[PDB]
Amino acid sequence: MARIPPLVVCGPSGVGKGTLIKKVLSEFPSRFRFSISCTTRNKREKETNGVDYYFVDKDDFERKLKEGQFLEFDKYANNFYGTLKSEYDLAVGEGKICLFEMNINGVKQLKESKHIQDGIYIFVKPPSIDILLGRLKNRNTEKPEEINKRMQELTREMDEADKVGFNYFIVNDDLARTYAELREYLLGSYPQLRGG
Ligand SMILES: Nc1nc2c(ncn2[C@@H]2O[C@H](COP(=O)(O)O)[C@@H](O)[C@H]2O)c(=O)[nH]1
């Protein structure tokens, strides 16, 4: 009998999917385990190694890849990101729903993986592209090239999301409203789920 399907959250940079995920984990902390991805990008000052990501250098990312540690990986905006088999295994051992956050290429890979039989895939959209571009611009500290790459990824992502096979599309206009919608979708999708 099938394991409980992982929850997979995808969307463009600047859409607020990280905050939505933190709200899910806040309401349902005993029910989900967040998959801590590896990334080669620089850690921001209030991110934490071993909570948000495992921040590694590109050499160590390549070593991990070649040693067979990843279920999927991609290059996004000049850095590498990857989902560890061990992190999915920890969720499974704990009897929890694994919660992944990954980009559209990672989604495509997970859907073809023989390690995971099914999943619930959600794409988070902005209220408008203009609003999202404005949100990216409000990141005072990111370099123009970094913003540039994230906006280039946005174009691809918005173009392809319709073709990938998401179970649900949600528009993050306001966190309270959007989370109220999201939690009802999750409760409907996971009859096993309750708060706490
Ligand atoms: N394919 C893949 N994408 C990831 C992974 N972790 C984060 N990402 C994606 O990479 C993009 C950039 O993440 P950020 O640098 O903004 O944290 C986001 O779309 C994020 O969801 C991963 O393990 N695999």
Side-chain angles (χ1 to χ4, degrees):
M1 294 174 184
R3 291 187 200 287
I4 196 166
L7 175 55
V8 188
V9 179
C10 184
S13 175
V15 82
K17 74 201 163 277
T19 305
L20 289 174
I21 290 165
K22 290 181 176 64
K23 294 180 78 67
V24 172
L25 293 171
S26 295
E27 183 169 10
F28 306 105
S30 308
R31 316 302 171 203
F32 293 92
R33 187 185 180 282
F34 181 64
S35 173
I36 304 163
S37 294
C38 291
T39 185
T40 64
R41 77 144 165 84
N42 296 138
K43 169 197 148 333
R44 308 321 195 209
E45 55 191 1
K46 290 297 190 202
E47 285 179 313
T48 302
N49 187 43
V51 175
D52 298 290
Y53 287 103
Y54 297 106
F55 297 93
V56 299
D57 68 26
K58 193 186 71 91
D59 275 0
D60 288 349
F61 194 98
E62 191 189 43
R63 293 193 158 77
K64 287 177 155 54
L65 176 57
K66 291 193 283 194
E67 295 307 291
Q69 305 289 347
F70 297 122
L71 278 167
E72 62 75 36
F73 71 105
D74 198 30
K75 191 163 45 179
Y76 174 96
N78 293 314
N79 286 108
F80 295 112
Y81 296 78
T83 294
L84 292 162
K85 290 166 174 183
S86 64
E87 289 282 308
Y88 174 68
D89 286 347
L90 290 169
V92 171
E94 290 184 358
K96 290 188 180 203
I97 304 165
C98 190
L99 202 173
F100 298 107
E101 183 207 278
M102 56 178 62
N103 74 353
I104 198 141
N105 289 334
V107 172
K108 290 189 269 195
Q109 291 174 67
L110 219 67
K111 289 176 97 76
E112 301 177 49
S113 180
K114 309 174 214 189
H115 281 122
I116 295 177
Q117 298 309 100
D118 192 17
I120 297 183
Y121 295 83
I122 300 189
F123 192 84
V124 187
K125 298 176 69 164
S128 78
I129 293 317
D130 170 67
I131 288 165
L132 187 35
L133 298 187
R135 292 199 85 246
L136 285 175
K137 281 187 269 199
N138 261 311
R139 302 179 171 185
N140 188 33
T141 68
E142 294 202 336
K143 300 291 196 144
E145 191 59 67
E146 292 169 315
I147 302 303
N148 181 47
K149 289 269 166 293
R150 289 170 183 276
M151 297 183 170
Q152 294 170 324
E153 294 285 4
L154 166 70
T155 303
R156 167 114 179 168
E157 290 163 332
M158 290 305 285
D159 189 53
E160 298 195 346
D162 27 294
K163 315 169 192 182
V164 161
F166 289 95
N167 295 97
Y168 201 79
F169 290 92
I170 192 170
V171 178
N172 190 18
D173 65 325
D174 169 63
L175 284 166
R177 189 219 64 80
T178 304
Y179 183 70
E181 176 184 356
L182 174 59
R183 67 186 295 285
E184 279 177 42
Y185 178 69
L186 294 179
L187 290 164
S189 296
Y190 287 108
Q192 315 85 347
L193 193 66
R194 86 157 184 89

